Amino acid sequence: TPLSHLRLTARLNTSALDSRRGVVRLHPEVLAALGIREWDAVALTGTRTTAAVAGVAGPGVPAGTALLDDVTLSNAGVRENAAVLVSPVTVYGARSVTVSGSRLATQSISPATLRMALLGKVMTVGDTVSLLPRDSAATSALASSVGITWTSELLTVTAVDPPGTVSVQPNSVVSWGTGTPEDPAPPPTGRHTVSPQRSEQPVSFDDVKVTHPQAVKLDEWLRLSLDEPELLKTLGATPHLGVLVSGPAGVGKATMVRAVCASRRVVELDGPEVGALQVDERLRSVTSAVAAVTESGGVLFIADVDALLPAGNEMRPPEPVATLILAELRKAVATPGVAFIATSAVPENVDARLRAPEVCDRELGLSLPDATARRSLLEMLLRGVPSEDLDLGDIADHTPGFVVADLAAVVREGALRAAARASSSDDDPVLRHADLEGALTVIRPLSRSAEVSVGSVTLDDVGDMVETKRALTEAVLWPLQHPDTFSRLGIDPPRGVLLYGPPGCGKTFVVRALASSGRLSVHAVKGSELMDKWVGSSEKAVRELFARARDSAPSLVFLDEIDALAPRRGQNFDSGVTDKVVASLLTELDGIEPLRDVVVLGATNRPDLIDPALLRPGRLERLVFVEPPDAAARRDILRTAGKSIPLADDVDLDSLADDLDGYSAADCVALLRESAMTAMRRSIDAADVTAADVAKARETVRPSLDPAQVESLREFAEK
Ligand SMILES: Nc1ncnc2c1ncn2[C@@H]1O[C@H](COP(=O)(O)OP(=O)(O)O)[C@@H](O)[C@H]1O
Ligand SMILES: Nc1ncnc2c1ncn2[C@@H]1O[C@H](COP(=O)(O)OP(=O)(O)O)[C@@H](O)[C@H]1O
Numbered sequence: 001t002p003l004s005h006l007r008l009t010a011r012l013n014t015s016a017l018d019s020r021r022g023v024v025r026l027h028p029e030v031l032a033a034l035g036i037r038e039w040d041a042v043a044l045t046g047t048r049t050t051a052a053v054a055g056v057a058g059p060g061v062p063a064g065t066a067l068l069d070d071v072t073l074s075n076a077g078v079r080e081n082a083a084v085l086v087s088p089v090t091v092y093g094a095r096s097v098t099v100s101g102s103r104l105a106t107q108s109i110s111p112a113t114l115r116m117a118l119l120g121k122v123m124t125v126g127d128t129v130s131l132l133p134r135d136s137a138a139t140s141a142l143a144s145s146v147g148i149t150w151t152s153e154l155l156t157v158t159a160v161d162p163p164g165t166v167s168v169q170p171n172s173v174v175s176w177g178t179g180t181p182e183d184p185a186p187p188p189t190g191r192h193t194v195s196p197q198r199s200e201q202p203v204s205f206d207d208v209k210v211t212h213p214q215a216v217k218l219d220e221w222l223r224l225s226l227d228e229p230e231l232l233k234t235l236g237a238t239p240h241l242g243v244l245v246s247g248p249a250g251v252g253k254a255t256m257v258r259a260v261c262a263s264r265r266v267v268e269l270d271g272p273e274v275g276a277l278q279v280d281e282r283l284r285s286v287t288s289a290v291a292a293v294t295e296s297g298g299v300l301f302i303a304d305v306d307a308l309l310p311a312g313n314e315m316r317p318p319e320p321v322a323t324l325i326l327a328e329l330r331k332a333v334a335t336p337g338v339a340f341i342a343t344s345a346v347p348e349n350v351d352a353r354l355r356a357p358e359v360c361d362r363e364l365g366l367s368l369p370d371a372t373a374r375r376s377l378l379e380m381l382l383r384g385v386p387s388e389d390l391d392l393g394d395i396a397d398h399t400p401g402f403v404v405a406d407l408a409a410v411v412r413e414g415a416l417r418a419a420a421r422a423s424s425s426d427d428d429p430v431l432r433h434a435d436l437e438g439a440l441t442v443i444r445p446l447s448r449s450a451e452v453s454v455g456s457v458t459l460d461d462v463g464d465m466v467e468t469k470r471a472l473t474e475a476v477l478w479p480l481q482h483p484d485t486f487s488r489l490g491i492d493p494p495r496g497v498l499l500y501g502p503p504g505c506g507k508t509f510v511v512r513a514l515a516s517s518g519r520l521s522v523h524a525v526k527g528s529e530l531m532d533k534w535v536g537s538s539e540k541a542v543r544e545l546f547a548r549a550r551d552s553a554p555s556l557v558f559l560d561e562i563d564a565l566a567p568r569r570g571q572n573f574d575s576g577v578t579d580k581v582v583a584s585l586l587t588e589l590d591g592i593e594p595l596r597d598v599v600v601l602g603a604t605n606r607p608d609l610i611d612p613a614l615l616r617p618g619r620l621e622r623l624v625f626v627e628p629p630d631a632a633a634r635r636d637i638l639r640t641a642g643k644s645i646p647l648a649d650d651v652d653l654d655s656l657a658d659d660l661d662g663y664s665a666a667d668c669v670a671l672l673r674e675s676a677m678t679a680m681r682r683s684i685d686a687a688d689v690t691a692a693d694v695a696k697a698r699e700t701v702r703p704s705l706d707p708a709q710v711e712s713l714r715e716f717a718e719k
Helices: 028-034 070-076 103-108 111-117 137-146 205-209 214-226 229-235 253-260 271-276 279-296 321-333 371-381 392-397 404-425 433-439 466-481 483-488 509-514 527-533 538-551 577-592 631-641 653-659 665-682 691-700 707-714
Strands: 006-012 023-026 041-045 049-056 065-068 082-088 096-100 122-124 128-130 154-161 165-167 173-176 193-195 242-246 266-270 298-303 338-343 362-365 496-500 521-526 555-560 598-604 620-625
Touching (some): 006 070, 006 665, 023 028, 028 082, 041 070, 065 082, 070 128, 111 173, 154 165, 173 271, 205 214, 214 253, 214 338, 266 271, 271 298, 279 321, 321 338, 371 404, 404 433, 466 483, 466 620, 521 538, 538 555, 538 577, 577 598, 631 653, 631 665, 665 691
Parallel strands (some): 006 065, 242 338, 266 298, 298 338, 496 598, 496 620, 521 555, 555 598
Antiparallel strands (some): 006 082, 041 049, 041 082, 096 154, 122 165, 193 266
């Protein structure tokens, strides 16, 4: 894919409340020309190369101007009012990030605190990052009540992994530079901690289960295994318990586990810290933790185990040490009075041998908070926090795709805006609605820090698809959001949905937008990846997926590229591997049919390549055809995507829509992208997209839809 880029003028961001937060201000036309949305990271290049998060510039900022704070100008090697190269950058989740600082901060600030303070932010080697933008007895009490422990010291990034540009994730490890010979070496990492029975917990079990109903099921599993083993023995069930908890990053998976195990003794390892250890020290750490949990019993908990036991991509299989690490865990699970719980944002990022009867026999998927749940979280985050008229309902309504981690960061930022307002007024800081709303202009949700992340796309980002949205809302959202009314009205349990249409028309895009609603756990796979890329049995991956969905209800099961997952008999010959998968799939689909809190949806560009047994009643029987965007639809798509692109008077998006027959939704989005770029390159100071700019763009952006293939898809439901 061609790497788009623009030279802009770099002006110093004069707003202190907008500076030193890892945010660069760009005109929307730049975002359009570069092919990115707000909150996407950009590469910034002067004499040096750095990266920052693209935030939309306020009014009064011409398209040819980028606003950079003092540290960004320094990191990019750009003088004020000088030229800067801006371009989209690939930002992977960091395995590790090594930072350097004073001997005092190196000894006083834990790696967990570092990760919390820098969560979601982009890092590049050589960069100067700030843990806190600003810095009295009432203000310090405020900072601590909101959870600000660290200070405002500027650090430097001495290393990242993988190389290039990375973002700090919950499964990342952020550790000090080890290390300057003069200064003392920093404390050891990757070793287990023990929390005794009935220990003081920051977040209670009651607090957790109001937005995470899955905590009730986890608690019930633990109690049966550890407290009432004769009940399970009477039924012939297994007394052992291994659980893999998954769900969006920072949604609160680890906090839920600690809350549920509050009355138990917990032996806890930090997956990333241990995973970063030298291979032999890594094994010893796991071994020490297993012997400790089996010495007295209780819960062995590994937060973010995907950093410790990565799934591997065949080019690199799992390391040999993983076999021995798994043997230790397996030994723990078989121990009476011992239970094993591990977390991971994406389950398939963990070694396949962990998702097995011998270690983790069952799984639990958490969900994004809906608007109601978000308001519950904000009120919880603001206990003992001096405030006025916060209007939390409005803040909750304006944070879709957010998680508690983000909301916490929103509140911390709000405390800074209050403390800044306080210092000028000399009054004691008191949070108002302005602070929280102002925080939203600088805080990037974790769901936007890396698509394919649940919450990155919302229905507003989807132009048009009125009829498709309508059908999906009624077929998927309505039954899940109203279980009892549907049952008492004698409405059938949610029918399986097959979503199909020509490429670049949003059949996948709209599902991802739909899946960001909240109060609904999403369990999604791409047909190709599960079959070809994943190390492990594909047939067991199917049963695993559905079992996690059943246990995490209300659940949506998204089988994208369903044609690859279940092709027609004869298309594949792999010693019966495909057969077992399809037969297992049919079996799972039939188990989902009577359920009311689980919906299954398959998507494909080629429905005729699916085994017809998938399309029988009780299975994927609701056929939703996604039409290519007509004249009406193209108007919406253009207007949605081109909303903030300044246009010249001789540009009419409506008449343009009528002329774009054969252009898919993606084609239209690309025509605006190309148009904006054509205008930016033509004249920076005369940025307004002209009719000629669009005319030139149409030379490179061609129609992609085949009228015969489109006809073939439309007739599919009747044939
Ligand atoms: N009820 C709560 N009150 C305050 N902070 C919370 C609460 N729940 C979660 N957090 C914070 O949000 C972040 C995300 O929680 P965590 O469980 O670590 O996410 P993950 O799902 O990635 O494990 C954590 O840093 C935690 O400190
Ligand atoms: N209605 C729409 N509005 C805006 N962008 C869209 C729309 N439909 C599709 N796209 C663009 O197309 C991309 C994916 O297209 P989609 O049709 O979902 O996949 P497929 O090619 O598998 O059908 C998305 O990243 C999105 O940018």
